[PDB]
């Protein structure tokens, strides 16, 4: 799993 915060960081 990739965490929800890491996903948001990568998109931001």
């Amino acid at each position, epitope marked *: *799993k990739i*965490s*929800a915060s890491r996903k948001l960081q990568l998109k931001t």
Partner: single-chain antibody
Amino acid sequence: ALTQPSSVSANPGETVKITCSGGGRYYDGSYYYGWYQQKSPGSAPVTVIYENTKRPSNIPSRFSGSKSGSTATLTITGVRAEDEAVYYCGSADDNMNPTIFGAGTTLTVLGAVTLDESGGGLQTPGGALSLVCKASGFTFSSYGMQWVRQAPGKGLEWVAGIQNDDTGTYYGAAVKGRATISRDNGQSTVRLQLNNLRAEDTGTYYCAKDASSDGGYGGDSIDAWGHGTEVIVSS
């Protein structure tokens, strides 16, 4: 946000199912949910299942979790009266909110990790408070940490989170621009500064440890909760 039923009832010994939907799709294309049990408003939530299926070792074997499509189900096989509680599901939304909670399902039955919050108290509207959580019993620098609050008689509400490496500080919509989360990995502490306080910020504020393997956090992955500290805002 997330959708779960307001209530479920069962007789002792039956199998109970509670289903939650509405979570955002994660980076790996899947969906992930956590289940958080609260037996009384005067007590901290307890994670019964996280990351869809993972059961903390101290949680009774009768709790299990599953996922189907974008939905998740908590199953209690052989329910007991002691299982009466509100069960909140948690996940992430599609974009800006890594942690979101359902409204809670109330179950009626017919017939070494420590997190220690401080800094609560009474404040007047417009003032500020600084909350602190001291952690022990785990490698603090490896894990994301979060703050979650609960107004009197209301459900769980995400306040803020921070990744293990100090980055990824994100905030709940109701506190945007008024909250700052920080952490000190050397002291095993996470801090929440709340400014421009409002009456409706009143509630119990819980520190929460995340279990995500990558040092991040989200609503599916809280594995430990503090005892809470009370914030009371009133003029």
